[PDB]
Amino acid sequence: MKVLVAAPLHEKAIQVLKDAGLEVIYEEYPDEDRLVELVKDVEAIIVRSKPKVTRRVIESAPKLKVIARAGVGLDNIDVEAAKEKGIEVVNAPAASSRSVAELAVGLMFSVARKIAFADRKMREGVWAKKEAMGIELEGKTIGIIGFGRIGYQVAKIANALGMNILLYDPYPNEERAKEVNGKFVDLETLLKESDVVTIHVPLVESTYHLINEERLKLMKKTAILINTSRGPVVDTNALVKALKEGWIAGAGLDVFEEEPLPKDHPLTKFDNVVLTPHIGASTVEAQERAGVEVAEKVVKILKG
Amino acid sequence: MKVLVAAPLHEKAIQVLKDAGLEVIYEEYPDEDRLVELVKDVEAIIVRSKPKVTRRVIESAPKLKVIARAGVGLDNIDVEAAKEKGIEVVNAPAASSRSVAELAVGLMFSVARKIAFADRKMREGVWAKKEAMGIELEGKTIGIIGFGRIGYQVAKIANALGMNILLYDPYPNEERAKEVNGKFVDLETLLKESDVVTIHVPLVESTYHLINEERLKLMKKTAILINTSRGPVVDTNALVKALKEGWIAGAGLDVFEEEPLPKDHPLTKFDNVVLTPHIGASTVEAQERAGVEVAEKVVKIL
Ligand SMILES: NC(=O)c1ccc[n+]([C@@H]2O[C@H](COP(=O)([O-])OP(=O)(O)OC[C@H]3O[C@@H](n4cnc5c(N)ncnc54)[C@H](O)[C@@H]3O)[C@@H](O)[C@H]2O)c1
Numbered sequence: 149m150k151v152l153v154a155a156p157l158h159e160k161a162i163q164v165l166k167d168a169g170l171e172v173i174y175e176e177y178p179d180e181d182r183l184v185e186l187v188k189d190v191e192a193i194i195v196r197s198k199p200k201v202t203r204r205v206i207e208s209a210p211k212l213k214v215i216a217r218a219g220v221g222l223d224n225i226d227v228e229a230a231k232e233k234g235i236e237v238v239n240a241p242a243a244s245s246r247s248v249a250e251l252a253v254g255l256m257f258s259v260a261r262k263i264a265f266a267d268r269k270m271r272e273g274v275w276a277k278k279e280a281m282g283i284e285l286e287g288k289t290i291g292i293i294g295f296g297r298i299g300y301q302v303a304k305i306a307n308a309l310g311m312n313i314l315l316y317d318p319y320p321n322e323e324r325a326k327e328v329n330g331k332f333v334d335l336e337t338l339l340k341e342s343d344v345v346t347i348h349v350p351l352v353e354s355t356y357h358l359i360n361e362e363r364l365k366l367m368k369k370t371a372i373l374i375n376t377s378r379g380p381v382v383d384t385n386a387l388v389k390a391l392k393e394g395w396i397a398g399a400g401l402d403v404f405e406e407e408p409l410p411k412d413h414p415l416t417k418f419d420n421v422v423l424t425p426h427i428g429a430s431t432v433e434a435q436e437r438a439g440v441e442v443a444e445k446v447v448k449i450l451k452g
Numbered sequence: 453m454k455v456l457v458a459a460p461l462h463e464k465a466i467q468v469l470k471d472a473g474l475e476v477i478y479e480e481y482p483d484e485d486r487l488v489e490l491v492k493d494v495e496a497i498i499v500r501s502k503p504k505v506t507r508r509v510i511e512s513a514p515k516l517k518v519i520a521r522a523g524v525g526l527d528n529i530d531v532e533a534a535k536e537k538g539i540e541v542v543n544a545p546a547a548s549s550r551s552v553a554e555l556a557v558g559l560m561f562s563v564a565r566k567i568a569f570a571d572r573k574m575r576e577g578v579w580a581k582k583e584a585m586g587i588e589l590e591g592k593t594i595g596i597i598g599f600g601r602i603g604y605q606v607a608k609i610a611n612a613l614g615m616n617i618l619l620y621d622p623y624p625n626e627e628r629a630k631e632v633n634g635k636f637v638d639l640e641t642l643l644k645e646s647d648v649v650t651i652h653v654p655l656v657e658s659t660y661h662l663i664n665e666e667r668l669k670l671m672k673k674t675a676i677l678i679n680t681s682r683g684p685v686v687d688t689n690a691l692v693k694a695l696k697e698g699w700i701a702g703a704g705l706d707v708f709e710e711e712p713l714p715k716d717h718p719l720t721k722f723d724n725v726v727l728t729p730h731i732g733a734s735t736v737e738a739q740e741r742a743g744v745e746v747a748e749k750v751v752k753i754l
Pocket residue numbers: 220241244245248293294295296297298299316317318319348349350351354355376377378402403426427428429430
C-alpha cells in the first residue's frame with residue numbers, strides 16, 4: 149500500500165506511516181495534472197490546506213481509501229465526490245485546540261495590559277507608561293461563546309487565571325462545564341455580565357454576524373472582545389462602530405472577513421485592538437500534532 | 453490627627469482614613485511651596501511617583517509622623533532626611549504583586565506567539581502569518597528565579613497553565629513550593645532545563661547582572677527570557693549579544709538599565725523582543741489596593 153504525502157509533513161508523522169509498513173510518496177503541492185498521476189496507485193492521500201483534492205483527482209484513484217487533511221476544515225477536498233466513492237475524509241481539529249486557546253488568552257492579555265500598544269510606542273522612541281494603564285484579570289468574568297474543543301481549553305486557562313467563567317452553548321455539555329466551574333447562561337446575560345467575551349463557534353448560517361450592533365451594545369463599555377473563531381462570525385462594520393463610539397473597551401482579533409486584511413483597513417487604526425494574521429493554529433506543536441494525528445488515522449483505516 | 457493627600461487617590465482609600473477618625477487634605481500633585489504649608493499641620497502624607505518629598509519639606513512638617521507611598525519604590529522621597537527626623541516611611545508592595553505576575557505571563561504569551569510582532573506588521577500592511585509561527589506553552593518548563601511575592605503568583609498561574617515549574621531561591625520555602633507543585637533546583641539546572649526563564653528577584657549585590665553572558669549561554673537556544681523585576685538584574689549588553697547570536701529565542705522586558713529607553717537602543721531592533729515601559733504595576737486594581745494598603749498603615753500608626 150502507498151500513501152501520497154502532497155504537503156509538508158513532520159518527520160514523526162512520516163515515521164508513523166513507515167513504521168506501519170506503508171510506502172510513502174512525497175511531493176508537496178503538485179498541480180492537478182501531476183496529482184492525478186500520483187494518486188493512481190495510492191490507498192491514501194495526506195494534504196494540508198492544499199493541494200486541492202478535486203473530483204477529477206478522486207475519480208482517478210481506483211485504490212483510494214481515505215483522504216486526510218492535516219489540520220481543520222475540508223474546503224480543499226471535494227467531500228461529495230469522496231462520499232460517492234465511499235472514500236473516508238478525515239482531519240485533525242483537536243490538534244490545534246490548545247494553541248488556538250492559548251492565542252485567545254494571549255490576545256486577552258495584550259489588549260487588557262496594552263502590551264502591543266506599548267511595545268509599538270517604545271519602538272517610536274515614545275515611553276507610553278502614562279497611557280499603558282490597563283487592568284488586572286484575576287476575579288474578572290470571561291464569557292465563552294461556544295463551549296466546544298477550544299472553548300473548553302480557554303475555560304481551563306481562565307480557571308488558571310482565577311477568572312469567573314460564563315458559558316453559552318445551544319448544546320451545553322454539563323460534565324465538562326463542571327470540570328472548569330463554568331456556568332451556562334443565556335447569551336444576553338453573558339454579554340451583559342462579562343468583562344471579556346471570547347468567541348469559539350463554528351461559522352454556520354446561525355452564527356454569521358452573531359456579534360452585531362445589537363449585541364455589542366449589550367456588552368460592558370469596559371469589556372474586551374476576542375475572536376479566534378471565524379471572521380464572518382463578527383460584523384466587522386458593527387465592531388468598528390462599537391470601538392469608535394466606545395461601546396466596548398477593546399478587541400483582540402485573529403480572524404477577519406477579509407484575509408489578508410486590506411491596506412489601511414479601519415481596524416488597523418485603533419490603539420485598543422491587537423490584530424494577528426490568523427495564527428491561532430500556528431505553533432510547531434499544533435502543526436506536528438495534526439500531521440501525526442492524521443497519519444495514525446490513515447494507518448488505522450488502511451492496515452486495520 | 454490630620455492626614456494630607458498630595459496625589460490622586462480613591463474613594464475607598466480616602467474613606468478608610470475618615471473611618472479611623474482622621475481629617476483629610478487632598479490636592480492632586482501639589483508643589484514644594486504649597487507643599488510646605490500643607491504638610492505643616494499634617495501628621496501624615498501620602499503620595500505616588502509624586503509629588504516629590506524633598507528634605508526641605510520633611511523639615512516643614514514638625515508634626516509629620518509617617519510618610520506613605522501608594523505603591524513601590526521611594527525614589528521620590530528623601531528617606532534619609534526622614535530617617536533623621538524619625539519619620540517612618542512605608543509603601544504597598546503586596547498591592548501590585550498579582551499585576552506584575554500577570555504582565556510577566558502576558559509578556560511570555562506575546563513573545564511565545566509573536567503577538568506584538570504580528571500586530572506591528574499588520575499595521576504596516578503586512579500579513580506575516582508565515583513569519584509568526586510560535587510555540588505552545590502547555591507542558592513546557594518555566595524557570596522562576598526568585599520565588600517571592602510575584603514569583604509565587606507566576607508559579608500559581610503557570611502550574612494551572614499546565615507548565616512544569618522550576619524554582620531557584622537562596623531562601624527556599626518548601627511549603628509554598630508544594631502549593632504550586634514547584635521544584636527547587638540550583639541556578640545552573642534551572643537555566644539549562646527551562647523553556648521560559650522569568651526573573652523576580654530584588655536588586656541586591658548578589659543579583660546585579662545575575663543574568664550575564666555565561667548564564668545566557670547555559671539557556672536553551674529556543675528559550676525565552678522574561679524580566680519584570682529590575683533592569684540591572686540583567687546585563688543588557690550580554691542580552692543584546694545573546695539575541696543577535698541566537699543563544700536564546702527572544703525576550704519580554706518591562707524594566708531596563710536605562711529608563712526611559714534611549715532613542716535607537718539595540719533592543720528596539722529585534723523582532724523577537726517585546727518591550728513595555730515599566731508597567732508591571734500599572735493596573736487600576738493595583739493602584740487602588742496600593743492606596744488602601746497604605747491608608748491602613750497610616751491609621752494603624754497614628
Ligand atoms: N484562529 C485559528 O487559527 C483557528 C484554528 C482552528 C480553528 N479555528 C476556528 O475557531 C473555532 C474553533 O471551534 P472548536 O474547534 O472548538 O469547534 P467545536 O465544534 O469543537 O465547538 C463549537 C462549539 O460551538 C457551539 N455552538 C454552535 N453554535 C453556536 C451558537 N450559535 N452559539 C453558541 N455556541 C454555538 C457548539 O455546540 C460547540 O459546543 C471554529 O470556528 C474553528 O473554525 C480557528
